[PDB]
């Protein structure tokens, strides 16, 4: 089990750790989060009490180093930092644990929610969607734009998601215009899976990362990316059976986790109706279709 210690909590803030969240008061004696499960990527996120705008946060993996949070009163945010001095870090964490100034990552033993949401998410790939190579962790916030958004303006502070565009020469083979537009199997299987992602695991990894950026930060470009990656599979007549079965499980857990009140802004009516009712895969997403019908029948 790993620990993300905090120097202090000088400003009142809602702290998120994965799907959990805690309120911390201005100057509350808070020194961080312990018992974090090793072997998963994690996100630690923040919404200031004084500014319910700018949700922001840090993707990290505890196996990649010793990370802590410290408030910066110049930039006005909780910053993730790496401590390279192993002994100084173990010594700081042990003191804070002894004085019980840390909240415990509150995992239920039965509960596989975080694993199911992050199954294909790999910290090494995140660092290539969010290029800040001097850090082992990745900052994301509500306002960050995608590379594809910046096409249609600061490239260093952008989300470098795989560009998907159904009305593109990349998506449409010369002389297969109608075939490739109505059946995107060639764009999915040859261009995207074989050409760019190499395998379905990396495709699902970016899809799961886009969803989580949309849910935790309300990042609009992330939402667009999540829906684009779903729509490319649902609009393909020819998808490996294992990809459809896994996609069904991935989406089921995403729909299960989505706050009930955020369905109006985080779910694209057109994409879901297409996937569940119109598309080649209308009969292939049993779990996803049952939970969507029982939880958001309005949207459909």
């Amino acid at each position: 089990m790993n620990t993300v210690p905090f120097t202090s909590a000088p400003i009142e803030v809602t702290i998120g750790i994965d799907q959990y969240s805690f309120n911390v008061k201005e100057n509350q004696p808070f020194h961080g989060i312990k018992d974090i499960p090793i072997g998963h990527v994690h996100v630690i996120h923040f919404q200031h009490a004084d500014n319910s705008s700018m949700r922001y946060g840090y993707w990290f993996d505890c196996r990649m180093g010793n990370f802590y949070i410290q408030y910066d009163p110049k930039d006005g945010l909780y910053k993730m930092m790496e401590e390279r001095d192993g002994a100084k870090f173990e010594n700081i964490v042990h003191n804070f644990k002894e004085r019980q100034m840390m909240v415990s990552y509150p995992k239920i033993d039965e509960d596989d929610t975080w694993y199911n949401l992050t199954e294909f998410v790999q910290m090494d790939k995140i660092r290539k969607i969010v290029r800040k190579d001097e850090n082992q962790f990745s900052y994301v916030d509500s306002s960050m734009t995608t590379v594809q958004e910046n096409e249609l303006s600061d490239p260093a502070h952008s989300l470098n998601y795989t560009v998907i565009n159904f009305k593109s020469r990349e998506a449409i083979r010369p002389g297969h215009e109608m075939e490739d537009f109505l059946d995107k199997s060639y764009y999915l299987n040859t261009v995207m899976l074989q050409g760019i992602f190499k395998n379905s695991s990396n495709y699902f990894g970016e899809l799961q990362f886009a969803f989580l950026n949309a849910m935790f930060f309300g990042n609009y470009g992330s939402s667009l990316q999540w829906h684009a990656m779903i729509e490319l599979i649902c609009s393909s007549a020819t998808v490996p059976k294992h990809m459809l079965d896994k996609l069904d499980e991935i989406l089921y857990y995403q729909i299960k986790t989505l706050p009930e009140q955020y369905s109006d802004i985080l779910l694209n009516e057109r994409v879901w109706n297409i996937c569940l009712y119109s598309s080649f895969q209308k009969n292939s997403l049993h779990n996803t279709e049952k939970i969507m019908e029982n939880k958001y029948p309005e949207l459909l």
Binding site: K167, S168, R169, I172, E177, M178, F181
Partner: protein, 237 residues
């Protein structure tokens, strides 16, 4: 974006543009089979591609052979239309290629946009105008060349005949839309109006009769009368 009654004059500026109408591309007769089921028999069609400034009509004849062994023909028709418009643009020299293509039906936007990805600088646009281009197959010489085609064929016309010698393209287009609207609302009455007086003939190289300016005013008046009457009948007002 979309073309309407406010940006109507744009049709007659010096930017090359084409209207595409796909309403006569896929044409069927519906009939009873021996077992008393219903079947369609396709008949020859046409893409109506018109430069509204010059009157140049690129009539691509769609021979029934293009549908042989194909499924979802109403959907294929839109993509076949996009494919032929694309091939037409690529066959034109650069300085003759349109800067805009206006489709009369919104269902053509994605088929044409995907077929024209190679031409990112050509704007594909819908219109809110209810243009009567479907009535093109009520023009006898256009109907005749379509029905006689034994193979795919492109035939070039000027749908304004020699009108631009005497009137502006704005007036030429308004005369064309009024003739086509008449033909669409009541073909028989419209065609009776046009051919009543056998001393006014159609030149071999024309589609419409050789009316003097005065006879056009009378004809144009008779077409408006036809259109308003039928409207009163349709809607009992």
């Amino acid at each position: 974006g979309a073309m309407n009654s406010s940006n109507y004059a744009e049709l007659f500026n010096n930017d090359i543009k084409l209207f595409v109408d796909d309403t006569n591309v896929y044409r069927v007769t519906v009939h009873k089979t021996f077992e008393g089921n219903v079947a369609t028999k396709a008949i020859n069609g046409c893409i109506f591609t018109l430069n509204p400034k010059t009157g140049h009509l690129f009539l691509k004849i769609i021979h029934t052979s293009v549908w042989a062994g194909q499924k979802r023909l109403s959907q294929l028709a839109k993509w076949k239309t996009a494919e032929e418009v694309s091939a037409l643009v690529r066959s034109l020299p650069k300085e003759e290629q349109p800067k805009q293509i206006i489709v009369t039906r919104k269902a053509m936007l994605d088929p044409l946009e995907v077929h024209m990805l190679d031409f990112p600088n050509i704007a594909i646009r819908p219109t809110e105008l209810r243009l009567p281009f479907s009535a093109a197959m009520s023009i006898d010489k256009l109907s005749d060349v379509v029905m006689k085609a034994t193979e795919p064929q492109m035939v070039l016309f000027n749908i304004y005949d020699d009108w631009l010698d005497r009137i502006s393209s704005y007036t030429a287009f308004s005369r064309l839309t009024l003739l086509l609207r008449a033909l669409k609302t009541n073909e028989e009455s419209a065609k009776m109006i046009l051919l009543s007086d056998p001393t006014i003939t159609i030149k071999s190289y024309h589609l419409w009769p050789s009316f003097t300016d005065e006879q056009w005013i009378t004809i144009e008046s008779q077409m408006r009368d036809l259109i308003l009457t039928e409207y009163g009948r349709k809607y009992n007002v």
